[PDB]
Amino acid sequence: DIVMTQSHKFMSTSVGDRVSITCKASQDVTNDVAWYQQKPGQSPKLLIYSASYRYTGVPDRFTGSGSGTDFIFTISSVQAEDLAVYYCQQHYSAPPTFGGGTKLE
Amino acid sequence: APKLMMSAQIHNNRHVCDFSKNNLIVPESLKKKEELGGNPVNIHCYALLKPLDTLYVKCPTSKDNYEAAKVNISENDNEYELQVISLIEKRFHNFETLESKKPGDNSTFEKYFKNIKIKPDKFFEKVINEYDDTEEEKDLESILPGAIVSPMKVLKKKDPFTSYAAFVVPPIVPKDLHFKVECNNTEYKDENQYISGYNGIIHIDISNSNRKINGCDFSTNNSSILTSSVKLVNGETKNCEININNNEVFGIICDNETNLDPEKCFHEIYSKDNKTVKKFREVIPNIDIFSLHNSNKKKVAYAKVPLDYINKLLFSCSCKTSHTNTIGTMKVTLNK
Amino acid sequence: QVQLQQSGAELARPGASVKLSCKASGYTFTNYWMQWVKQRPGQGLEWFGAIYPGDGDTRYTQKFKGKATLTADKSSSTAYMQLSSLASEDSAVYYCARSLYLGAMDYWGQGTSVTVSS
């Protein structure tokens, strides 16, 4: 199975800052990566699909980039409600696999 | 014979077949005896077309279209194309009684095939006549004027390994008409060379039912297609009305200056009363309809109604110009 | 209008079995994957397995193949996940999630909590 590594379990940022979260695939997955946001007590929400496309209704401050093995999720200007755990996931090869998540504080 | 098959027939107007994939990666009982690469196989699929029916051909999806499917999957298809999918979703893998006998990474598969390389783009608009060695990919229309033809498109974006294309044969053929299309790919296997290629092919014939038909040509009185016409081409609305029956053939022909309204006639029809476009399935869903919503051109449509057809409808189809301020048309009273 | 409604919380004794449900509405059930995602208390997301009800194909992460069974009822647009021989490691929230086959999970259920305890 493909391993998705989010090397940072935790990430701190101020309201109004830019922040980037990294996710590395153990093999090439092309653009078959999704990013999810999970806030306490809630189901995960899809934010980015196919590595760099904003999902329907996702605010403009959220973006993603990358192709191959190195992927980046970015918040251009963090808002106070953006604290959550962010997860990457690959679906290039079955079974889909999740990164370990990064908690934004 | 070679590995010959006829396309499957559905209703009285649909023909369909496909090509297989991943067949040169054989088991050791064969592979250990092999060296220096894999080769294509002698597989053929045949179509026999009559006026106004539709031929569907399915091929392994090119890597470009595969990658596109992975984002296009988020979009929906219209009902007609979904119905088409149910016509053509069948895969053809007839192993007969495969009883104790030898048989006869999703983008990695696409890459593994070194990017599947089948006939590209408007698979059936640019078509090869079997007339001569040039094999020129001619406009379908220059052989079959008024023909309706799709771009090539993915079968199920959620099963993005198969793509397909289709076209509708008009009433007029240049006598003994033959076309062909083909679908190639590559692969490799457990040998000392690690290369391999594969191919599939379709031969398209016609039956002895071609003739001029009804339909009120909007380009010329000296129609090469129709037994009826409408005075003048443009600048003012002109029209026809016709009493036709099942087992008769009729249609609508726009000029280069005009286009069909209904956009997908005949799948849609114009209701004279209340001035509105409806489906050719509103009261008669159990129906052979001789057209294609995703066609490359929306200027010409006709219908060949068989004797076993059970339907009846009073409706119209029209042609409108770039000014839009016209209803130039023919009223179709089918089985009136 | 796409909705996934999951069943209520379960308390189960070790060694017993439980069957969770995920009722889908608002889309063509047989054009999509229904998958399950496991989240143990305080931990990350684990992709569990999926069924494609259109053809019945199932796919499991290897570690979960032994004890879990995924099924679907096309007539009611409902997916089921059955956990057997429950152990403390099975205590978790299980989410169902819609995706195109092998794709991004766009709609999620609210989750069902399973607690394994004597």
Numbering used by the authors:
A (entry chain L): 1 to 105
B (entry chain B): 1682 to 1785, 1803 to 2034
C (entry chain H): 1 to 52, 52A, 53 to 82, 82A, 82B, 82C, 83 to 100, 100A, ...
Paper text:
Two sexual-stage surface proteins essential for Plasmodium transmission, Pfs230 (5) and Pfs48/45 (6), are expressed in both gametocytes and gametes. Pfs230 contains fourteen 6-Cys domains, whereas Pfs48/45 contains three.
Fab 2A2 could be resolved in the Pfs230D1–6 map, while Fab 18F25 could be resolved in the Pfs230D7–8 map. The epitope of mAb 18F25 localizes to Pfs230D7. 18F25 primarily engages with the Pfs230D7-ID found in between β4 and β5, with a small amount of interactions localized to the β8-β9 loop. Unlike the 2A2 epitope and Pfs230D4 overall, both the 18F25 epitope and Pfs230D7 are more conserved. Only two SNPs in Pfs230D7 identified from the MalariaGEN Pf7 database have frequencies higher than 10% (Y1829N – 69.4% and I1870V – 13.5%) and these are not contained within the 18F25 epitope. Mutation of the most polymorphic residue, V1801, to the three different SNPs identified in the MalariaGEN Pf7 database revealed a negligible effect on binding affinity, with Fab 18F25 maintaining wild-type level nanomolar binding affinity (V1801A: KD = 3.6 nM, V1801L: KD = 2.6 nM and V1801I: 0.9 nM, respectively). While the rarer SNPs D1803N and N1804D have a more moderate effect (KD = 181 nM and KD = 92 nM, respectively), nanomolar-level binding affinity is still maintained in these cases. In contrast, both Pfs230D7 and the 18F25 epitope are highly conserved and may represent a yet unexplored opportunity for subunit vaccine development.
